[PDB]
Design a protein around this ligand. Structure first.
Ligand SMILES: NC(=[NH2+])NCCC[C@H](N)C(=O)O
Ligand SMILES: NC(=[NH2+])NCCC[C@H](N)C(=O)O
Ligand SMILES: [Zn+2]
Ligand SMILES: [Zn+2]
Ligand SMILES: [Zn+2]
Ligand SMILES: [Zn+2]
Ligand SMILES: [Zn+2]
Ligand SMILES: [Zn+2]
Lengths: 228, 224
């Protein structure tokens, strides 16, 4: 007596092209969206997305506001204490600073300067722990961070290379800084889909679906589309 | 520190084949090597006919098998498979260009394939008016086709497509087979049923490999 296909409710933060972002007609799109839709199709489910701040996603997941989270989210040990992750669906990569082109080369060069980043991220934890001479400025959206960079309120913005690279396409006055951050205490954990801790049946359905999606020519094409 | 011994059948470009330097190469070779790297293991290959791989795996001749092998129900009774590492796709016949259009047109004719394959079982069960000619090796089947001893060779679209690139007198037949009862299961790495510790390591390795940009590049190398 069901009157619709099962619907899997995903939480995300659509501030982060090419992983997830909002297009011209206010629709959520990106690599993660294509992945989640493909997973839902394998599960014979419809997909629903809720867009909210990145730092609120794990808490809302735990509060049962949605079934799963996909948001370019590294499977860190800290997050693994709070949620259950799927198998990695994509690799965790190196973090970069974007600054005015030629203005900074290294983290040392940023001594005493303001660098914007997102609340709740690997990037925030890395800068706070390992680059204490730099002032981290927390935002609930990389979009506000970029605005503040362009208005000279910040000297840099620190995030995933794909996201920064994407932003740079429309901002040639800026450049990825030479020194990158790769510390494996912070970086290199794969991207995962998160579910609540006591939700193994759903998690294993998601894993079984990812096994299939990741073996598909379409999944190679998703990477080609979003990461080239 | 460790070696993983794979059994394969290097008769099936681009999955696995012998190149002009007498070395075994291909998509499956790259995948198995990547799996071995994640497991911090050396990679070793044994080359033998496709229909002997599973009996040999059970006999403990090697640890695993990778050979563009579909994960069929009949095989799962005999061995354990990893998660899929590539999709099982459509099967096609190659013939002299324009000579045949449908399986119906091949009535009472000889069509080559490897023994023990999905393609064999589909022909025998679904195209009984066609004579199956079972080979140990696709290489020999192709040779017979060029020598007019067969009317067609029946196999996976990538392998047939790859052979075609150097044989322009031939063509993929109009009617293709993708019957879900024989095709579409997905390719697996096979291990022995009582070797679940090894199976779990390979699955954990594949989880990482399949999440990698390198694995997308592998497909772009071998399938485009
Ligand atoms: N949708 C987003 N805003 N994602 C931000 C992710 C940043 C980084 N990859 C992390 O795991 O913390
Ligand atoms: N290495 C080979 N000769 N592989 C043949 C595979 C043919 C077919 N995909 C099967 O599973 O039966
Ligand atoms: Zn729900
Ligand atoms: Zn749109
Ligand atoms: Zn917040
Ligand atoms: Zn798994
Ligand atoms: Zn061995
Ligand atoms: Zn034989």
């Amino acid at each position: 007596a069901s009157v619709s296909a099962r619907t899997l409710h995903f939480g995300t933060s659509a501030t982060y092209a090419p992983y997830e972002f909002v297009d011209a007609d206010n629709k959520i799109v990106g690599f993660d969206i294509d992945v989640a839709n493909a997973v839902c199709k394998e599960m014979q489910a419809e997909c629903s997305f809720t867009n909210q701040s990145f730092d609120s996603l794990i808490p809302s997941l735990r509060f049962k506001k949605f079934d799963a989270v996909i948001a370019g989210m590294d499977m860190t040990p800290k997050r693994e204490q709070q949620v259950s992750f799927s198998q990695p669906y994509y690799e965790g990569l190196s973090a970069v600073v974007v600054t005015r082109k030629g203005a900074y080369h290294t983290f040392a060069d940023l001594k005493g300067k303001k660098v914007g980043l997102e609340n709740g991220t690997t990037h925030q934890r890395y800068l706070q722990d390992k680059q204490q001479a730099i002032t981290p400025v927390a935002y609930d959206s990389y979009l506000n961070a970029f605005t503040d960079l362009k208005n000279n309120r910040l000297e840099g913005v620190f995030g995933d290379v794909a996201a920064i690279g994407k932003w740079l396409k429309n901002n040639p006055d800026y450049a990825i800084m030479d020194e990158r951050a790769s510390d494996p205490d912070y970086y290199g954990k794969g991207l995962g889909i998160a579910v609540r801790k006591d939700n193994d049946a759903l998690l294993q359905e998601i894993n079984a679906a990812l096994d299939k999606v990741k073996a598909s020519p379409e999944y190679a094409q998703m990477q080609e589309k979003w990461f080239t």
